Amino acid sequence: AVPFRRTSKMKKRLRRTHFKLNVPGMTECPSCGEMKLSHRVCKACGSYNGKDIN
Amino acid sequence: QAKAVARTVRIAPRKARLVMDLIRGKQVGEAVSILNLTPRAASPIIEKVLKSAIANAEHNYEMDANNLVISQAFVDEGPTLKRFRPRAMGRASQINKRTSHITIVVSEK
Amino acid sequence: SYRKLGRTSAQRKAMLRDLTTDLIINERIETTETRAKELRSVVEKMITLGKRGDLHARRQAAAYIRNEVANEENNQDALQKLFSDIATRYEERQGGYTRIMKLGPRRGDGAPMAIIELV
Amino acid sequence: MKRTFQPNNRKRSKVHGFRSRMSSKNGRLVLARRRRKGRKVLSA
RNA sequence: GUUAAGUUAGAAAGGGCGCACGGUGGAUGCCUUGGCACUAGGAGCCGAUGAAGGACGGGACGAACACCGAUAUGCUUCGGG
RNA sequence: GACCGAUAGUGAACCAGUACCGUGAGGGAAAGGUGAAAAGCACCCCGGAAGGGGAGUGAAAGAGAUCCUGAAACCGUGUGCC
RNA sequence: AACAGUGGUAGGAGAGCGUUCUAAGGGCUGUGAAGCCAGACCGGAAGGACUGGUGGAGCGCUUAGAAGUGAGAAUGCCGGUAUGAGUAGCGAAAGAGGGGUGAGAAUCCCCUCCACCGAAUGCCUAAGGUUUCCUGAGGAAGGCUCGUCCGCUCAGGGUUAGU
RNA sequence: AUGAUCAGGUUGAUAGGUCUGAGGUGGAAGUGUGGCGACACAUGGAGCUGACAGAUACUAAUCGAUCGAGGACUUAACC
């Protein structure tokens, strides 16, 4: 249970080539103005599905 | 052509680079949106200094909010805080608390 | 199946009882997603129970929900407030007395919050 | 799991105190060489 | 534009090699307040008339160095300036 | 001084026999450099600040508090070829 | 000119290269030295020039002398930085919900339920520690996360005995 | 395990409710009777039911967005 050799630079990058994290999914808010996630209520306008939520 | 830097903000540079690389080369007005809507540790810091970067237009040479894009931007290491976490068998292992420099250079197109 | 919520059955049951009492208390809950998903079904069977509204129903709902104060000036306890007001309000809609609104996750842990309200 | 050092001010000053070291001749040599060395805390 | 079987650029999730610009880190160069070894000279003891060395304390705020001793960041009394 | 020029030279060029370790005897470090002068950043913008971007001083700001020079390991960013 | 020779460990011999000082003579330098960085230049070698960029004051050459004089290895020593690897771990435990502060709230404060201990995880008080106690500010470091918070920092304040 | 696969996303039965069931536990409470009494009876195969199977638009699968074709030489063959 020990690394027998050091891992070289290209091996290190080649392992890390999948560890990049994906973008979220944005959608334009029902209330105008800004960006929001899908299926989340609006953070700024405070609305969802056209309806208003306090 | 505006530039702002972070200059040793206490955060691991790799954990910075992961959320940092996804805004490379796209329009700022939606880049700020995707970045404050992704939950990461680094997102408020890069949010802050990116808004400072676009904010270098007020008492500055004049550009405008639209037609403006990130040209190039990167994360650079700062000096590391040496810390010694105690460990079993009295071994006294050593840990590194890293700091990072974050660069944003933004130009109009 | 049904979720475990990261705790064994005793404090799990105590947890759900406490949340549903809170729901009847203030008709609107902010909590995480999975607590909301397993919350919905149980509070709405208590709503069916209150709609039934007989004495066997009173004792059954007493055996699960707990006695807080719900309208202090009338000293209305949660049981009687349920059994009088909310059953009379929602007697007509034969199911689905709950709504889930999802939000952005918390700063602390990225736990996905949800809005629960009774409607 | 009683460790190797229990603190006691009285026994400490009795067995390593300034009077205790000055009482002996050999302790006087200890004082002299420590003072020549220049230690801040010169005796216990 | 159908065959048919043949021949070939082409890519890049990423990477490799060169180039450029960075950061980190403090090597190198330069410098010296210090130190080493000596030369010539002086001096080669102090202490109950209380030593060596300390503790405490003293300043327009308070710490530490340095100075001093309830006469406490000094004083009297000769000289230099 | 055909002695050293800060991993050297005393352990100690720097509040060192200190910090620290040991119950005690004892052991015993690391740590020099802005500028000629602080003339050390008025004022504005981002921000809670930190930090930056401007304006100003200087011969220099890449000279802005380990601040002369800033090699290498290491780590990034664009790319010419594959 | 001719002839012959020219693998090589231990080894032995001869030629040299380079560094720091020191004298002698010569000169180079803010019109930019040393050092650094980059080049497709020169010699048989160790190496040595030239041209740019940085740098902002010292240094070559000639001949001779004197050396703390040449590093890749010693499980060498010191400093810095990689690899594991975004992995292991995050140190016995039941919270949850609403309000409030705040730039930011699972972690701070208020309230309601629930839970745990209870010959103790309660209350006094030794040894020991020495302000950690209280109040008001602050959140760079300490807090195995966060932290508006404290046993952290800062500024004050606090211990009264004839028994 | 996460990816992945599959069923679904408002002209829809995907999941959770509601109603009806299967099945399981088995005689709920509250009444009234008898009994001093612990109790036993009737109301009544009552009451309750996690995953199971049918219906039901009650609640949630909304507005969005992103990716993703335009095609080289010869022999046969015919526009």
Side-chain angles (χ1 to χ4, degrees):
Chain A
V2 55
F4 181 81
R5 295 302 322 299
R6 85 211 310 289
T7 48
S8 91
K9 308 204 196 212
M10 52 76 88
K11 291 299 198 220
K12 168 207 295 216
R13 306 204 190 73
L14 255 289
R15 157 143 45 76
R16 299 222 157 83
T17 197
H18 275 160
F19 166 103
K20 76 73 190 170
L21 71 73
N22 95 340
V23 75
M26 291 56 68
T27 175
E28 170 58 40
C29 201
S31 58
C32 314
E34 72 293 24
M35 220 57 267
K36 67 162 209 67
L37 275 297
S38 72
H39 300 76
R40 299 333 176 272
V41 307
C42 180
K43 283 163 81 133
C45 273
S47 52
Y48 187 86
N49 212 352
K51 258 301 313 305
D52 193 5
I53 166 61
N54 332 299
Chain B
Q1 186 31 268
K3 151 143 118 176
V5 86
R7 201 62 53 161
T8 52
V9 152
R10 189 33 202 93
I11 164 172
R14 317 157 34 80
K15 299 175 155 63
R17 285 150 173 189
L18 267 299
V19 80
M20 162 56 187
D21 90 2
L22 52 75
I23 40 184
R24 188 98 46 86
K26 54 202 71 53
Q27 217 282 340
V28 51
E30 51 76 20
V32 55
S33 316
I34 87 160
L35 172 152
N36 73 335
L37 302 213
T38 166
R40 292 295 302 166
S43 86
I45 307 75
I46 324 183
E47 179 305 323
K48 277 311 299 293
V49 48
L50 168 38
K51 301 214 91 73
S52 211
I54 165 62
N56 316 112
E58 171 56 41
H59 152 250
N60 203 65
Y61 40 88
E62 312 318 324
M63 321 67 67
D64 90 325
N66 38 319
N67 63 53
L68 185 31
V69 72
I70 177 64
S71 86
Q72 45 94 5
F74 48 92
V75 164
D76 163 339
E77 337 172 338
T80 89
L81 281 293
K82 305 254 170 166
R83 289 300 112 91
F84 293 109
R85 162 140 302 261
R87 190 151 283 285
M89 297 347 294
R91 259 279 77 77
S93 160
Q94 182 251 44
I95 62 145
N96 314 327
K97 284 213 230 163
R98 307 254 172 189
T99 65
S100 318
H101 303 180
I102 302 73
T103 65
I104 320 94
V105 153
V106 48
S107 71
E108 81 256 40
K109 267 309 292 167
Chain C
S1 181
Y2 54 111
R3 292 186 167 78
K4 298 212 158 227
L5 305 310
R7 44 206 62 210
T8 181
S9 201
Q11 70 290 32
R12 179 161 71 250
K13 183 163 137 323
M15 161 95 78
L16 292 325
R17 286 166 76 174
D18 154 38
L19 301 325
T20 167
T21 36
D22 266 288
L23 198 31
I24 326 163
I25 276 303
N26 45 18
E27 63 306 350
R28 180 174 280 198
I29 293 331
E30 184 27 75
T31 166
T32 177
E33 184 126 2
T34 75
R35 282 180 204 179
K37 273 185 197 261
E38 282 241 10
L39 198 130
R40 169 164 38 67
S41 100
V42 294
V43 48
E44 102 173 329
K45 44 206 92 43
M46 331 315 288
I47 278 302
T48 320
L49 183 33
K51 194 183 321 193
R52 229 178 83 175
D54 80 37
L55 186 32
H56 203 35
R58 304 292 291 228
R59 298 201 171 178
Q60 277 211 245
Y64 184 108
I65 88 163
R66 221 176 327 279
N67 34 20
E68 316 55 52
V69 79
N71 209 20
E72 58 303 351
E73 62 294 27
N74 322 111
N75 329 298
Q76 187 150 44
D77 156 79
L79 207 36
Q80 50 177 262
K81 146 179 182 193
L82 176 142
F83 253 118
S84 62
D85 296 26
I86 295 96
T88 43
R89 289 184 48 216
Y90 293 13
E91 81 68 10
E92 323 73 10
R93 233 172 78 221
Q94 79 287 325
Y97 326 91
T98 313
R99 269 203 166 111
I100 285 58
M101 285 94 107
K102 320 195 188 133
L103 307 100
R106 47 158 53 158
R107 191 253 203 175
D109 273 294
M113 300 325 178
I115 277 287
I116 272 284
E117 83 293 19
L118 80 76
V119 84
Chain D
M1 192 55 158
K2 182 183 171 244
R3 265 301 189 278
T4 179
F5 172 76
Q6 302 338 96
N8 184 308
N9 291 289
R10 194 166 171 280
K11 320 173 52 163
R12 165 170 176 88
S13 192
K14 273 298 272 303
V15 86
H16 299 332
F18 171 71
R19 293 187 86 84
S20 67
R21 314 214 97 84
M22 191 75 37
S23 61
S24 165
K25 164 281 181 173
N26 277 344
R28 219 158 300 104
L29 282 201
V30 152
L31 274 312
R33 61 204 204 88
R34 276 186 80 86
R35 222 190 306 258
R36 172 249 300 273
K37 177 54 166 71
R39 288 282 188 74
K40 185 80 168 325
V41 54
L42 181 175
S43 157

